[PDB]
Amino acid sequence: XDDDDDK
Amino acid sequence: XDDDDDK
Amino acid sequence: XDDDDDK
Amino acid sequence: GPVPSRARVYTDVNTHRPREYWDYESHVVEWGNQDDYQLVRKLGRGKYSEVFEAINITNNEKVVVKILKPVKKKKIKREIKILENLRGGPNIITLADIVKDPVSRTPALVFEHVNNTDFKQLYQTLTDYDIRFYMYEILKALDYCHSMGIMHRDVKPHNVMIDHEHRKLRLIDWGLAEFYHPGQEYNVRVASRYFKGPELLVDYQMYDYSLDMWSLGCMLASMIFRKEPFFHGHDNYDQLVRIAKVLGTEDLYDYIDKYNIELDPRFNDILGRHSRKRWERFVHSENQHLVSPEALDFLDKLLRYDHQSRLTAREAMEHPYFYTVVK
Ligand SMILES: *C(=O)CCCCCCCn1cnc2c(I)c(I)c(I)c(I)c21
Ligand SMILES: *C(=O)CCCCCCCn1cnc2c(I)c(I)c(I)c(I)c21
Ligand SMILES: *C(=O)CCCCCCCn1cnc2c(I)c(I)c(I)c(I)c21
Ligand code: NA
């Protein structure tokens, strides 16, 4: 996929 | 990964 | 530190 | 200038090899066939990687595929060469294949699969014996990679896969590892903050395999004291302040003087003066079942400012802390 995940 | 490479 | 006094 | 230093063990391994052993920029990659693999389920994401459980559809073998995001080819070859040089060593993750999409040219590394435990579940369940066992298993991997002229440089819990149901351990993430050449000055912007050795924090560049032993000691302290991370700095300067509040400043300044290390005057100002705190002061009701005199003596011999004074991995394997595991 694409978007950056964080918490 | 706090850091990436050596120079 | 912000000044160069090296040998 | 700073006083030079050389590793106490395995000092000259790389000069006892053909140049191509360590001259990873000349490495010619052996590429397999990407069509042999199909993804199964995503396991995690790295700064430069996407990690999946996968299957080899030619022979049904379960594997892990690490798809690499655009980084310099030089770094990819370094990681490949190191994985090939270490392949087969105890508890070193095994590189199975190296493939690339013929259209997008995205490369991927293919490894044996590990079913890694939640490190939260893992902490709740490990006994004193378990910590000793897994620590010895990590030491086997580190002694092996040091004996082959390589420092890992990123030892930390996230890079130690433990499948506690299978009592199985692998050291992973060789992307920061480097070949040790005596006298060479290395980049100190390696390891994760909480696991960085004092040499990195004071900008002492002629470090060696003993960096990994500092990191290992940070892991041991977090496990036996149930405090993760053990040294919890806000930044790289605070990280040395946190260390100095345990090991004390007297030994820190002895280390700096011994190697003729120059600190920023303002760094010197914030370090102050701190007494050494005995390791017994970190024992509490909730962690005392993991602590013994042997554990504290072992820890004390890893977490030393002077990198030359730390146990080597081979010396560490001889410590009485491990007698219950091996004999
Ligand atoms: C989205 O969160 C992660 C990025 C998507 C990764 C899948 C890319 C397409 N794809 C599907 N199977 C693949 C294999 I098997 C290999 I080897 C490669 I390189 C790629 I690109 C694959
Ligand atoms: C800084 O450390 C963040 C980037 C680290 C990405 C870690 C994802 C988990 N991971 C990475 N490589 C893995 C392998 I090879 C294997 I086998 C397994 I199981 C896992 I989970 C991996
Ligand atoms: C050259 O400027 C290197 C920077 C010197 C370190 C200062 C870090 C930020 N900072 C400033 N004062 C601090 C104190 I007093 C303390 I205690 C801490 I921990 C930190 I981070 C400080
Ligand atoms: Na036993």
Number of domains in chain D: 2
Does D90 share its domain with D189? Answer: no
Using an 8 Å CB-CB cutoff, list chain D residues near B6. 153, 176, 178, 186-187, 190
Does D277 share its domain with D320? Answer: yes
Task: From D113, D132, D159, give the residue that closes a domain.
Answer: D113
Q: Please, which contacts does D217-220 make with residues 24 or more away whose CB atoms are closer than 8 Å?
A: D217/D299, D217/D302, D217/D303, D217/D310, D218/D156, D218/D194, D218/D303, D219/D138, D219/D155, D219/D156, D219/D157, D219/D160, D219/D195, D220/D131, D220/D135, D220/D295, D220/D298, D220/D299, D220/D302
Question: At CB < 8 Å, which residues of chain C contact D?
Answer: 1, 7
Does D296 share its domain with D198? Answer: yes
Cα angle for residues D151, D157, D162 (degrees, 5° grid): 100
For chain D, the chains sharing at least 3 beta-carbon pairs closer than 8 angstroms are: B, C
- DSSP letter at D92 equals B
CB within 8 Å of D2: residues ≥ 6 apart:
D204, D206, D259, D260, D261, D262
Which string of DSSP letters, residue by residue, matches D309-322?
A: GSPPHHHHHTSGGG
Q: How far apart are CA D23 and CA D137, in angstroms?
A: 29
Does D63 share its domain with D91? Answer: yes
Does D232 share its domain with D101? Answer: no
Query: Residue D241: how many CB atoms within 10 A of its CB?
Result: 19
Which string of DSSP letters, residue by residue, matches D196-231?
A: --HHHHTT-----THHHHHHHHHHHHHHHHT-SSSS
Chains B and D physically touch (3 or more Cβ atom pairs below 8 Å):
yes
- Ligand with an atom nearest the CA of residue D98: 1
Q: How far apart are CA B5 and CA D191, in angstroms?
A: 10
The domain in which residue D226 lies consists of 5-22+114-327
Give a three-class secondary structure readout of D121-177: HHHHHCCHHHHHHHHHHHHHHHHHHHHCCEECCCCCHHHEEEEHHHCEEEECCCCCC
Does D176 share its domain with D76? Answer: no
- Ligand 1 center from residue B6 Cα (angstroms): 28
Tally C–D CB contacts below 8 A: 5
Q: Which of D153, D145, D146 is nearest to D173 (CA)?
A: D153
CATH number at residue D121: 1.10.510.10
- Ligand 3 center from residue D207 Cα (angstroms): 24
Cβ distance C7 to D1 less than 8 Å, yes or no, reads yes
Closest ligand 3 atom to residue D238 Cα is 19
Does D121 share its domain with D108? Answer: no
Does D98 share its domain with D217? Answer: no
Q: How far apart are CA D179 and CA D191, in angstroms?
A: 15
**D204-224 burial by CB neighbour count: b if 16+ within 10 A, else e?**
bebbbbbbbbbbbbbbbbbbb
Task: From D81, D96, D113, give the residue that closes a domain.
Answer: D113
Does D173 share its domain with D55? Answer: no
- 3-class DSSP state of D258: helix
Q: Judge if the beta carbon of residue D63 lies within 6 A of ligand 1.
A: no
Task: From D113, D146, D177, give the residue that closes a domain.
Answer: D113
CB within 8 Å of D280: residues ≥ 6 apart:
D296
Q: Which of D36, D41, D80 is nearest to D64 (CA)?
A: D41
Does D150 share its domain with D286? Answer: yes
Query: Residue D7: how many CB atoms within 10 A of its CB?
Result: 21
In angstroms, the separation between the Cα of residue C7 and the nearest Cα of chain D is: 8
Closest ligand 3 atom to residue D266 Cα is 5
Whether D36 sits among the annotated catalytic residues: the reply is no
Which residues, in sequence order, are bridge partners of residue D298? Answer: none
Element (H, E) at D80: helix D73-86
Gyration radius of chain B's alpha carbons: 6
CB D90 within 8 A of CB D73: no
Q: How far apart are CA D14 and CA D208, in angstroms?
A: 13
Does D226 share its domain with D312? Answer: yes
Does D88 share its domain with D129? Answer: no
Strands D37-46, D49-56: pairing kind:
antiparallel
CATH number at residue D83: 3.30.200.20
Cα angle for residues D53, D54, D58 (degrees, 5° grid): 160
